[PDB]
């Protein structure tokens, strides 16, 4: 199988500068090289260049709507293209708003996919529910069919077509949810596993359950959208929205490994890694390193070890 | 439902100064305010003023017995008063010795209550088993019926009436038990979940089991007596008896949330937070903050999010 | 039962200086004294003195083969001697390469023993698979019967006799395995529980399973070879091969306690504690302290508490 890395150095989705540098940091950490060492064929598609929409006025509260919509429209395009060719897309990005694009494009080629969202937040605020004007917190809203029309059209997202329904997505790691967001997910009956459920069940049962839930009937393509703030700050401190009591490094890797074992990994998102937000270089090295780890995990690397087939090491 | 916060700035239960400042710290962290944001009606009853008993001689080994017994007798009174009115008591305190009062008063109004004790210790030493005259380590002994007479009467605790038996209390988080203490709990066949049980079962099964055990037959009122040292030092470092390998922040919240879900929370104790014992302001900010969190959890705040009823955020 | 502490201040098994100081550090932490406080009879056999083999040339890649083989031959001797007498051997050592000796000697007296290997690595590289001539990474290879002849004889290990087979050993905590090592363990069908299994099952089921696997049919003696890097660097930072996302302090203790409860603890190894590798004195105090704890755990100390029999504390 083939892998196509795609940088998405974007940051207008939120108010803290730095996330754009994410892809650079990950690459610098030897993501590509390491990935190549896997049983997969890899090709770096470089970092997309986002044209900045001059005079991007704040749609009501939402900020930089046109910049975000265009950047995403450009991504969904690049993504759909590679998916078409039958290669696994890996978007290294800035903020989580780019998920809109990454997923829209993926849906185009595999309209039946499901989405596994590991984040500490739901990012399902509609332009009508956000406190901030931050789009990195509304991604899911632009992708859910059930939310269609539930909020004004947005300057630049005209091109988006609610691809998945609330029955095809599953959260994991929720711990900081806005009232509006809770309302929604409860109303649309969206499956989820907040840290309280992870606590109760254990990452073991969690994955077991999300898999039956999303792949019980039909076996569809999987889209792993990983918000790095999904892990506890102690592992991925360099992020914009650190929230305590999150997923442990192990839990993070257990997830990525099980998804590997399904063999249904079609698309992947590694978002929110902000190099500039580390209090000590260590914090940044740490954040990045596990990001890479989660990635390699997705593509094979087991914690029990791996050996090349047909080779008698003895 | 109504909530009544009660400060118990007491510290004679143990040898390290600072715990009295506990309530102030918690309030300063905006405990009251936040609580108000909950679906509950809150009223701060202020910090009780404890009259210091001059020439409080050490009964054998036990220290400051009269100061402790009077402070508690004063509390049990204030507590019984609010419980009477049908409001939920929340004792913000200094050391865990004030549990005597908090519980005695609570029993008066609900003699059928059960007690969930999250602590790293048992605090069940009788004045005959303590190494240190510290009363903060003997609370349970003064409350257990089965221990009645098993130790000399104590200067000031005359007014106490062993309210609950060993069949109505359950420990959670034990990890530093004195030989005398182990003898007792094993002899009185008291239900408990030490870190080794939590490790074996998982906080999931733990809560499940303590609930069946204490609420299987009849549904009674719940009294949560939370010793802050129940969580690993890494979360609540600012305490007098830090003991490694304790309850994780998550585990702590899971507990408080399940108890919320029973709807049987009648009384609550937030003890041992000592602001002065933090090596770095962070350690104190950290300790306090999660204390508040455990509190808000008890009263609703879910990690999955919360939304106000009858409001269409859409 | 009797306990015999044996220091093995060795370090030629690997390239970082300091591990020889391990025993000193552990003793200085009051290991002996504390052990004495247990229901066990203890005797310190002091630290063996290892004669350095001059002009120890690198057998191909392997480094200091003769120094290592001799030091081990000297240990297996000292060990076999105490085992003979019917006392439990506790090897406090430098690097994990001394496991060769500790186990060989133990096998002599109890050829039916089983080995529980808690380490973050497998240390099963044959002199033909190692990237680094480091012997501390090949211990298991010199002990497995199934590996006999699968690699050239080594200058000084002539005296070793593959005592156990792949059906009598069980790993716990694996997370950094070399390709060669993975090949082997997969080829020899060796039972193991890498962190991913621990994640799936929980330390509870893990121990339960390893016990049924190794003690299902016959009840044999247990040899606990504990590599300190088995625990996450956040607990035992002072080691040469720190690897993230490892065994939690609790998990570590849970293991040692269960093995205590089988009553089949015959031999024990506390390896890799390197006092000189701590970034801050705290890291070293921390590493050592838990080492001691895992030890006392093996010999009784429960997290739920312990009380002396026949004594009425009341
Ligand atoms: C980013 C997220 C935590 C949040 N929903 C917001 O308002 O941006
Ligand atoms: C406080 C507690 C750990 C202990 N039982 C004592 O003697 O005070
Ligand atoms: C030490 C270990 C991690 C490794 N197998 C080596 O080559 O030394
Ligand atoms: Mn996000
Ligand atoms: Mn997030
Ligand atoms: Mn206590
Ligand atoms: Mn305590
Ligand atoms: Mn080792
Ligand atoms: Mn190791």
């Amino acid at each position: 199988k083939p892998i196509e890395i795609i940088g998405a150095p974007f940051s207008k989705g939120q108010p803290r500068g730095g996330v754009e540098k994410g892809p650079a940091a990950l690459r610098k950490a030897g993501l590509v090289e390491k990935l190549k060492e896997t049983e997969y064929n890899v090709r770096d598609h470089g970092d997309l260049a986002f044209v900045d929409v001059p005079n991007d006025s704040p749609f009501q509260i939402v900020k930089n709507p046109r910049s975000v919509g265009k950047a995403n429209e450009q991504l969904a395009a690049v993504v759909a293209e590679t998916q078409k060719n039958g290669t696994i897309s890996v978007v290294l990005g800035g903020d989580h708003s780019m998920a809109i694009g990454s997923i829209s494009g993926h849906a185009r080629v595999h309209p039946d996919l499901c989405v596994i969202w590991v984040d500490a937040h739901t990012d399902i605020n509609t332009p009508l529910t956000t406190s901030s004007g931050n789009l990195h917190g509304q991604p899911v809203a632009f992708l859910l069919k059930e939310l269609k029309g539930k909020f004004p059209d947005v300057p630049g997202f005209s091109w988006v077509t609610p691809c998945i329904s609330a029955k095809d997505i599953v959260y994991i790691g929720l711990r900081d949810v806005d009232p509006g967001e809770h309302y929604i997910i409860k109303t649309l009956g969206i499956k989820y596993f907040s840290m309280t459920e992870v606590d109760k069940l254990g990452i073991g049962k969690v994955m077991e359950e999300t898999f039956s839930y999303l792949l019980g009937r039909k076996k569809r393509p999987i889209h792993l959208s990983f918000d790095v703030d999904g892990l506890d700050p102690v592992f991925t401190p360099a992020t914009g929205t650190p929230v305590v009591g999150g997923l442990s490094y192990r839990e993070g890797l257990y997830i990525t490994e099980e998804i590997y074992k399904t063999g249904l990994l079609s698309g992947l998102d590694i978002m929110e890694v902000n190099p500039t937000l580390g209090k000590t270089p260590e914090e940044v090295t740490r954040t990045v390193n596990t990001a890479v780890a989660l990635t390699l995990s997705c593509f094979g690397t087991k914690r029990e070890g791996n050996h090349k087939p047909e080779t008698d090491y003895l």
Side-chain angles (χ1 to χ4, degrees), chain A:
Chain A
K1 203 64 187 301
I3 307 299
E4 173 125 314
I5 281 62
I6 298 170
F10 193 59
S11 67
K12 280 65 170 52
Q14 43 83 64
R16 291 169 180 279
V19 258
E20 68 274 10
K21 304 194 180 71
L26 291 176
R27 288 215 175 79
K28 189 62 131 60
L31 172 36
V32 183
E33 300 60 55
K34 288 181 184 297
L35 273 171
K36 293 177 181 178
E37 290 186 54
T38 68
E39 77 178 323
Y40 290 78
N41 251 275
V42 207
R43 187 213 160 196
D44 194 319
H45 181 290
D47 292 326
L48 306 181
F50 303 112
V51 289
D52 224 308
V53 174
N55 193 43
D56 196 354
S57 309
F59 183 74
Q60 287 184 53
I61 260 180
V62 189
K63 305 169 185 129
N64 296 301
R66 309 180 194 65
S67 302
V68 179
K70 179 55 190 175
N72 272 297
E73 181 170 44
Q74 184 184 324
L75 176 58
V78 184
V79 178
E81 196 73 62
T82 22
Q83 277 293 319
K84 182 199 315 318
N85 305 305
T87 76
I88 303 175
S89 54
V90 180
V91 179
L92 314 187
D95 72 67
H96 217 172
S97 77
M98 297 302 288
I100 299 190
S102 180
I103 300 174
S104 285
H106 196 178
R108 289 177 189 168
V109 185
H110 293 95
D112 56 310
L113 61 60
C114 53
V115 183
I116 295 183
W117 197 275
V118 286
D119 179 324
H121 323 93
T122 44
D123 312 331
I124 195 164
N125 278 311
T126 61
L128 300 178
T129 63
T130 201
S131 292
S132 62
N134 303 339
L135 276 167
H136 74 152
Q138 312 179 56
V140 188
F142 292 67
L143 299 173
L144 276 187
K145 297 182 169 175
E146 293 86 325
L147 264 46
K148 191 145 181 53
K150 302 300 178 180
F151 58 108
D153 303 303
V154 184
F157 300 84
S158 37
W159 62 278
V160 184
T161 306
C163 45
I164 75 304
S165 59
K167 239 55 189 175
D168 312 299
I169 178 178
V170 176
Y171 286 102
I172 293 180
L174 307 170
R175 79 182 84 94
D176 189 34
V177 190
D178 304 315
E181 290 186 288
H182 187 223
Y183 183 72
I184 299 177
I185 68 168
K186 291 302 294 175
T187 286
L188 282 58
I190 298 177
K191 189 67 168 179
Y192 62 61
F193 295 89
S194 68
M195 299 305 308
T196 87
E197 279 73 57
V198 185
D199 287 324
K200 176 189 179 60
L201 314 177
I203 199 63
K205 182 62 187 175
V206 178
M207 292 318 278
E208 209 168 83
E209 276 192 46
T210 93
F211 283 145
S212 74
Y213 174 95
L214 293 175
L215 314 180
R217 268 166 285 168
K218 304 286 183 296
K219 274 46 190 177
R220 56 256 205 62
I222 300 171
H223 181 71
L224 178 42
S225 187
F226 206 128
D227 179 327
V228 96
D229 62 21
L231 299 199
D232 191 286
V234 183
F235 302 107
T236 57
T239 340
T241 1
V243 180
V244 294
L247 294 170
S248 77
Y249 181 83
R250 285 157 46 167
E251 298 178 339
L253 288 187
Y254 183 74
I255 295 188
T256 53
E257 302 180 316
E258 277 305 300
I259 284 177
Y260 165 75
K261 285 169 49 196
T262 74
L264 304 179
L265 181 59
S266 191
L268 202 201
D269 301 335
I270 300 298
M271 330 290 276
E272 299 292 349
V273 175
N274 196 321
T276 88
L277 294 172
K279 282 171 280 299
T280 89
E282 127 75 336
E283 304 217 333
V284 173
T285 307
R286 202 201 305 182
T287 298
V288 175
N289 295 334
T290 95
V292 171
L294 287 174
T295 299
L296 301 185
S297 175
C298 295
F299 301 108
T301 316
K302 281 167 170 49
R303 282 187 275 166
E304 74 157 56
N306 306 106
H307 73 268
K308 229 152 300 172
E310 301 182 355
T311 299
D312 175 54
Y313 291 91
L314 292 170

